[PDB]
PDB file of C-alpha atoms and ligand atoms in Angstrom:
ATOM      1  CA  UNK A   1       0.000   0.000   0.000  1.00 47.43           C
ATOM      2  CA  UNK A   2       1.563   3.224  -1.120  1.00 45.44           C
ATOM      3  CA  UNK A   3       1.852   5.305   2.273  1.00 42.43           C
ATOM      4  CA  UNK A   4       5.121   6.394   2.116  1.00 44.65           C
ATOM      5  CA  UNK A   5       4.427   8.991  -0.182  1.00 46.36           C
ATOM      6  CA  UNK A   6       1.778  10.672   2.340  1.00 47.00           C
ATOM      7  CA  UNK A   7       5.140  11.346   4.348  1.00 46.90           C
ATOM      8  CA  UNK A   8       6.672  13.686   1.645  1.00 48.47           C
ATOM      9  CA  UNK A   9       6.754  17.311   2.250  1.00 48.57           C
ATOM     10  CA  UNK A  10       3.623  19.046   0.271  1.00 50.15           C
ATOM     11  CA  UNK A  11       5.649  21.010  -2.221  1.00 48.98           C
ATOM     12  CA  UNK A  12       8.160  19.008  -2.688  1.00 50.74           C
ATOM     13  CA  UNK A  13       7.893  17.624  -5.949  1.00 51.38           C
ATOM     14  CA  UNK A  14       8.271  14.249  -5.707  1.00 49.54           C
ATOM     15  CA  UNK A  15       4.211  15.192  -4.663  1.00 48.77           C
ATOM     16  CA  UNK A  16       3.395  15.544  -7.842  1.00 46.83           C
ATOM     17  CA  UNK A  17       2.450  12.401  -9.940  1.00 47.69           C
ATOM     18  CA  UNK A  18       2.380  12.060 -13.400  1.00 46.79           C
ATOM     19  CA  UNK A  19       0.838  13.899 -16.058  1.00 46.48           C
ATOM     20  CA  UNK A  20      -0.162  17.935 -16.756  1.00 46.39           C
ATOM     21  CA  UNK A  21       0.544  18.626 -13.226  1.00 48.11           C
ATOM     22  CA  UNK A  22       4.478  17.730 -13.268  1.00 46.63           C
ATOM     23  CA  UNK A  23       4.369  19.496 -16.765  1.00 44.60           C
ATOM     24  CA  UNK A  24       3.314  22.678 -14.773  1.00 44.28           C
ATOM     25  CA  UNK A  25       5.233  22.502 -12.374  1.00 47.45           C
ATOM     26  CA  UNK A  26       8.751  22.263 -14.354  1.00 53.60           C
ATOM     27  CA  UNK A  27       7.202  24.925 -16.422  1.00 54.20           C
ATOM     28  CA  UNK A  28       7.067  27.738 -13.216  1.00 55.18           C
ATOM     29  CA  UNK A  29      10.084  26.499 -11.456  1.00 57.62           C
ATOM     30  CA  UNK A  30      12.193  26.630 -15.026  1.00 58.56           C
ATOM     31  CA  UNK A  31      10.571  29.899 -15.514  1.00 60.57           C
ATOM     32  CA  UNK A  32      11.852  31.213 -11.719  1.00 60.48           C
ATOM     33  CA  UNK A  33      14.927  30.237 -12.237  1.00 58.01           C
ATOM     34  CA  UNK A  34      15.208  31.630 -15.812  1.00 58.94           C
ATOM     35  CA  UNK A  35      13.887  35.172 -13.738  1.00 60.49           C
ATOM     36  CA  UNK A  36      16.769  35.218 -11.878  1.00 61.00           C
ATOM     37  CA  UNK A  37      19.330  34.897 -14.205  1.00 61.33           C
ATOM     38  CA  UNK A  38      18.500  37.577 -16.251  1.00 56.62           C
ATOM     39  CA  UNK A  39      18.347  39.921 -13.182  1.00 56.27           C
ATOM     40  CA  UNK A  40      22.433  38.715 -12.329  1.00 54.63           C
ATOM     41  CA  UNK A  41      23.165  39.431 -15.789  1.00 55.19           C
ATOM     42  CA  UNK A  42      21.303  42.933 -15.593  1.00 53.09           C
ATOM     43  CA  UNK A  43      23.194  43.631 -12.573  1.00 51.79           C
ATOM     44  CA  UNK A  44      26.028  42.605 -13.821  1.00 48.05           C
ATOM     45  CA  UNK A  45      25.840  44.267 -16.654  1.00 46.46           C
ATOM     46  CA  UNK A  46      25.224  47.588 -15.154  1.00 44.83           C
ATOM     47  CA  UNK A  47      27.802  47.660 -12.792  1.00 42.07           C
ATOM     48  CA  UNK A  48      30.268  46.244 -15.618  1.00 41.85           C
ATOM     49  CA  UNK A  49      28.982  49.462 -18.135  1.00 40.63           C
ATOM     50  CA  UNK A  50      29.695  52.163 -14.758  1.00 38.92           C
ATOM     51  CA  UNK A  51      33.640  50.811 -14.307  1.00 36.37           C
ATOM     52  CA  UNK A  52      33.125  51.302 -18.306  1.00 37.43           C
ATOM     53  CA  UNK A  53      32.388  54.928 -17.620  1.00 36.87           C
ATOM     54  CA  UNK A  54      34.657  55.556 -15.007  1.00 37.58           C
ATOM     55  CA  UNK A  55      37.506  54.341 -17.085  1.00 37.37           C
ATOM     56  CA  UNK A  56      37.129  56.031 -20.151  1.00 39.69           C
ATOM     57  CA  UNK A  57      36.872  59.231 -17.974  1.00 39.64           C
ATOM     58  CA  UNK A  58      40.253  58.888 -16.425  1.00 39.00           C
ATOM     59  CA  UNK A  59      41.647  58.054 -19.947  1.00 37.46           C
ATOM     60  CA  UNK A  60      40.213  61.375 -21.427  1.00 37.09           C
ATOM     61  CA  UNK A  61      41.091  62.893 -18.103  1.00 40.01           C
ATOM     62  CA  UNK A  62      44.911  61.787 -17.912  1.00 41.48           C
ATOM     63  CA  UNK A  63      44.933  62.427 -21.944  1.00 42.03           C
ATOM     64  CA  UNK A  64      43.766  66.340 -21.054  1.00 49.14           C
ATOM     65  CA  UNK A  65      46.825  66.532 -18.540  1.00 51.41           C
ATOM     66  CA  UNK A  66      49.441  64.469 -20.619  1.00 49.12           C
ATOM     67  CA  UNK A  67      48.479  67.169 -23.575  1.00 52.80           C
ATOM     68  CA  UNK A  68      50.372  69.382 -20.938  1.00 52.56           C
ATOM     69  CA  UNK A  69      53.711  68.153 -22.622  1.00 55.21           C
TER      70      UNK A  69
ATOM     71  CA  UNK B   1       9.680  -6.253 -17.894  1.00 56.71           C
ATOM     72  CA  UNK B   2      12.066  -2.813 -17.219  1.00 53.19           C
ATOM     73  CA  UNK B   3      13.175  -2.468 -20.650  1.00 47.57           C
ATOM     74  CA  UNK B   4      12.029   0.878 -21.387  1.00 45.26           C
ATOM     75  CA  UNK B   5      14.979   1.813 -18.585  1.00 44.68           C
ATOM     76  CA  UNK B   6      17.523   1.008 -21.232  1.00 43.80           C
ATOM     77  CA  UNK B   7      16.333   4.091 -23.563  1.00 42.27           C
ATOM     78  CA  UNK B   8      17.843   6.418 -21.276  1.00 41.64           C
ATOM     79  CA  UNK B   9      20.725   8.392 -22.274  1.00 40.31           C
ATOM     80  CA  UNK B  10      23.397   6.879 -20.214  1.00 39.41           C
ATOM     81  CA  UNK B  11      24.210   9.902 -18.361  1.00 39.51           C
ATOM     82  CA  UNK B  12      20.906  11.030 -17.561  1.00 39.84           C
ATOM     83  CA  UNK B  13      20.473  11.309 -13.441  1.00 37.76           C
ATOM     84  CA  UNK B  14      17.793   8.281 -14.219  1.00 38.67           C
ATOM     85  CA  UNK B  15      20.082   5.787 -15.259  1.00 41.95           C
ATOM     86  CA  UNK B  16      21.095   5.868 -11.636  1.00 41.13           C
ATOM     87  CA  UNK B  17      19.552   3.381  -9.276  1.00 43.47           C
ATOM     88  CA  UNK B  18      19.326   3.482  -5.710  1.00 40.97           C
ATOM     89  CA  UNK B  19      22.103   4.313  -2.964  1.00 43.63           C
ATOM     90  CA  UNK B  20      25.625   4.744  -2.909  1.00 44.96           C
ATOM     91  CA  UNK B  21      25.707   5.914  -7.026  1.00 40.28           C
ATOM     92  CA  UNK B  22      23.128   8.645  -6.500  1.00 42.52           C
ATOM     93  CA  UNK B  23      24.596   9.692  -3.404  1.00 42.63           C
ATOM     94  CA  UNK B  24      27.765   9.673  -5.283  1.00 43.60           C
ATOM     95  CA  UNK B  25      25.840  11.614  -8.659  1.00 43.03           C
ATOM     96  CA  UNK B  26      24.550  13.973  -6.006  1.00 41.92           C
ATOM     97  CA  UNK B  27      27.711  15.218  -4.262  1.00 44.15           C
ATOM     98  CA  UNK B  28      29.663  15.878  -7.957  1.00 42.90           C
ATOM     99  CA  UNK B  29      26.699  17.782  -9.525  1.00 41.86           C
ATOM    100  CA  UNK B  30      26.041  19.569  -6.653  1.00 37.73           C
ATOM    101  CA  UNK B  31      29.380  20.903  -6.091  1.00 37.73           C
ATOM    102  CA  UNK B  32      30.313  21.488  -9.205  1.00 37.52           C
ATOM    103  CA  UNK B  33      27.033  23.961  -9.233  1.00 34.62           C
ATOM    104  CA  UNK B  34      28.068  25.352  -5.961  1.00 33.57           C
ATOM    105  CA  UNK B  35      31.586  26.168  -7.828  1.00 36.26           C
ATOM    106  CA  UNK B  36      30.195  27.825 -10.656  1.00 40.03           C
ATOM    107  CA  UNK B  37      28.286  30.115  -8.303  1.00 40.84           C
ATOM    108  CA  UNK B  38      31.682  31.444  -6.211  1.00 39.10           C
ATOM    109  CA  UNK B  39      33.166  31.907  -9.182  1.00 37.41           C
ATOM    110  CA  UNK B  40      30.497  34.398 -10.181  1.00 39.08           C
ATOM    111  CA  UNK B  41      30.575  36.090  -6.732  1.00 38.10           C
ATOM    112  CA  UNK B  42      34.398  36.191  -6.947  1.00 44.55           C
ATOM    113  CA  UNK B  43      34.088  38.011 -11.034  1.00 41.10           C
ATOM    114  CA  UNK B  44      31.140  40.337  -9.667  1.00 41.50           C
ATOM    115  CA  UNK B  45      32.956  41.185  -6.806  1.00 38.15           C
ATOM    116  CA  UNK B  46      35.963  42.083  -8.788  1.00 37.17           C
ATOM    117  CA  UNK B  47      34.357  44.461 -10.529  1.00 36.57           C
ATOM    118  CA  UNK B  48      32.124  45.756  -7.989  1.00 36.42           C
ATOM    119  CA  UNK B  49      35.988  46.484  -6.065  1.00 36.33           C
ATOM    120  CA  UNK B  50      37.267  48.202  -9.506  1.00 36.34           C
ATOM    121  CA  UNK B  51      34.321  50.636  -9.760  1.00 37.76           C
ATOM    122  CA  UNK B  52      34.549  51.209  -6.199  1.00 34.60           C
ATOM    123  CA  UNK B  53      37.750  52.290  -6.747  1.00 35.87           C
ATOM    124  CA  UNK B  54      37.498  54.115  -9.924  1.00 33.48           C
ATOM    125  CA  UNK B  55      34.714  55.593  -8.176  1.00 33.55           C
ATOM    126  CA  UNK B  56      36.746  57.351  -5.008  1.00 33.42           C
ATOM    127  CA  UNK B  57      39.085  58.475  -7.516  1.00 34.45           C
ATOM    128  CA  UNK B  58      37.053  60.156  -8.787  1.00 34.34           C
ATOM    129  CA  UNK B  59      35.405  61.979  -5.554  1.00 35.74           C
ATOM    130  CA  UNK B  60      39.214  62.980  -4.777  1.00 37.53           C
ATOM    131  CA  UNK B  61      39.818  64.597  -7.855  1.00 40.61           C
ATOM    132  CA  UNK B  62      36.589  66.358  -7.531  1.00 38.50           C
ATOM    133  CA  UNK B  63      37.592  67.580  -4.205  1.00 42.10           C
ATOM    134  CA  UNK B  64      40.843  68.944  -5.567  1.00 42.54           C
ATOM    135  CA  UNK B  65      39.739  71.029  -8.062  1.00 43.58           C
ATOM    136  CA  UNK B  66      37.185  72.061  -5.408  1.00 41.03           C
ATOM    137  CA  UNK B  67      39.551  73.188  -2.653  1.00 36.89           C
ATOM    138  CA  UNK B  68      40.362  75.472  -5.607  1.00 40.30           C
ATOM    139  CA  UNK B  69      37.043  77.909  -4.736  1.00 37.92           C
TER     140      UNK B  69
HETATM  141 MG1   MG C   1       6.543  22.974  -7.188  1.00 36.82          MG
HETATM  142 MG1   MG C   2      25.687  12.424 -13.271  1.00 37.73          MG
END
C-alpha cells in the first residue's frame, strides 16, 4: 500500500504524480529560475557598463593633462 | 519487464539506481554547481571592487579642483 508517499513534504515535488501537473510545475520552477538569471546578468551588466564609464573618464582625463607636454 | 529503462541516455540522473551511485551523482553535480556560483561572486565582486575604486578616484579629484574655490 503506497503510504510512504503521504510522508513527503507538500511542495516538494516528488508530490506531484504524473501527467499535466508535473508538466506545470517544471514549467514555473524553469521559468523562476530563468527570472533570476536575467536579473544577475542585468546587474552585472550595469555595474560592468559604470567601471566602463569611469575608465574612459580617467583616460580622457589623464589624456587632457598628458596634452600638458 | 524494465526495458524501457535502457532508452535512457546513459548519463541522464535516471540511469542511476538506488544508494551509494546517487549519493555519489549527487555530491559531484552539486558541487560542481556550488563552484560555478563562487566563481560568479568572486568576477562580480571584482568588478564591484574596480568601480569602487574608480569611483573614489574620482570623488578625490573632484575635491581637488574644489579646494580650488
Ligand atoms: Mg513545485
Ligand atoms: Mg551524473
Amino acid at each position: 500500500l503506497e503510504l510512504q508517499g503521504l510522508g513527503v513534504d507538500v511542495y516538494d515535488q516528488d508530490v506531484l504524480e504524473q501527467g499535466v501537473l508535473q508538466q506545470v510545475d517544471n514549467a514555473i520552477h524553469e521559468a523562476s529560475r530563468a527570472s533570476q538569471l536575467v536579473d544577475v546578468e542585468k546587474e552585472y551588466r550595469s555595474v560592468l557598463d559604470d567601471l566602463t564609464s569611469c575608465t574612459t573618464s580617467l583616460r580622457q582625463i589623464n589624456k587632457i593633462i598628458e596634452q600638458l607636454s
